[PDB]
Structure 1
Amino acid sequence: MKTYVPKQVEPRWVLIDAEGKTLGRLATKIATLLRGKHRPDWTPNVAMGDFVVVVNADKIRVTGKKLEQKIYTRYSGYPGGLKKIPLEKMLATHPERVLEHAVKGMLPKGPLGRRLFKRLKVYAGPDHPHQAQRPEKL
């Protein structure tokens, strides 16, 4: 025969917690969902993996000293442009990042790996734009 090709599938939204979950353990799952890898109809080259909006990120938990320890680096092309912000302050200002980040490096990278990150919309809250389905999960 010849293995099957899902036609234009509908984009199923979801929603996951945040608060209480361990930062990394979360994405691990979350990731998989952004791609079709949970779906019994996954396909590499199409991105039909679930739009994961997330609620109250600001209360993400994580282990050890990572609160203080963990360092979020950023380097402009300008010599000496290396700016390293800690997980700590990173919670305090725009905490949503920390998730989106832990995440954004659990995808692959070719032009769609980033298309998929657009398929993700966390907030520190809860709240979101109640657009549709978004059936809660666990």
Structure 2
Amino acid sequence: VIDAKGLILGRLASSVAKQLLSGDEKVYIINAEQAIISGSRAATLREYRETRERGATEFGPYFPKRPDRILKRTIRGMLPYKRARGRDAMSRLKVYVGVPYELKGAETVTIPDADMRLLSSSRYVELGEVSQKMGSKF
């Protein structure tokens, strides 16, 4: 159970993906809305609305909207998810907005190298902000 609050999105995703590929545990990620994406808010929002409205969304790419599902997608992009190994890895991963009631009070962990206070500037936005500006209710 990893707490995604104040964590770099890509670095948390890389850590969790490599742990899942090491393949001895089920990983739960809570407060996915509280993950951090470094860079200017305008640029991040522009790229994320481009990815959301890009594809042949009738029969093309289907980029998610909820922050937890977006984080799941980000981890999926760092996995061999078309393979049996990556399919098992994604099946062993659950991501939550906030803390689910069953995991409430459980002991969490944090990735020290994914911490947002190692960033050198204030040019960042939260995944929850990205999702709610793309129109996700959570």
Q: Offset of 1:127 from its aligned partner?
A: 2.4
Provide the rounded CA distance (Å) in 1 between the counterparts of 2:85 and 2:56: 24
1:57 aligns to what?
Answer: 32
Separation in 2, partners of 1:101, 1:84: 10
Unaligned runs of 5+ residues in structure 1 are 1-14, 37-47
Matched ranges for 1:1-138 at <5 A: 15-36=1-22, 48-64=23-39, 65-70=43-48, 71-72=51-52, 73-75=54-56, 81-82=59-60, 93-108=65-80, 109-130=82-103, 135-138=107-110
The answer to which structure, 1 or 2, has the higher relative contact order (CA under 8 A, 6+ apart) is 2
- 2: CA distance, partners of 1:57 / 1:123: 6
Q: 3-state DSSP class of the match of 1:35?
A: helix
CA distance in 1, matches of 2:12, 2:24: 16
Residue segments in structure 2 that go unaligned for 5+ positions in a row = 111-138
Q: Provide, for residues 15-45 of structure 1, a one-character-per-residue CA deviation record: whole Å limited to 9, x for no partner.
A: 1111211111111101111121xxxxxxxxx
Query: In structure 2, do the counterparts of structure 1 residues 130 and 17 end up closer, same or farther at CA, with 3 Å as the change threshold?
Result: closer
Q: CA deviation at 1:74?
A: 4.7
Deviations 1:40-62 (A, max 9, x none): xxxxxxxx332110111012210
* C-alpha spacing 1:67/1:21, structure 2 compared with 1 (3 Å): farther
Give % identity.
31
Larger radius of gyration: 1
Partner Cα distance (2:33, 2:26) in 1: 20
Contact 1:35 1:50 in 2 (8 A): no
- Name the TM-score, length of structure 1 as normaliser: 0.61
Residues in 1 aligned to 2:21 and 2:62: alpha-carbon distance in whole angstroms: 30
RMSD between superposed Cα atoms in Å: 2.6
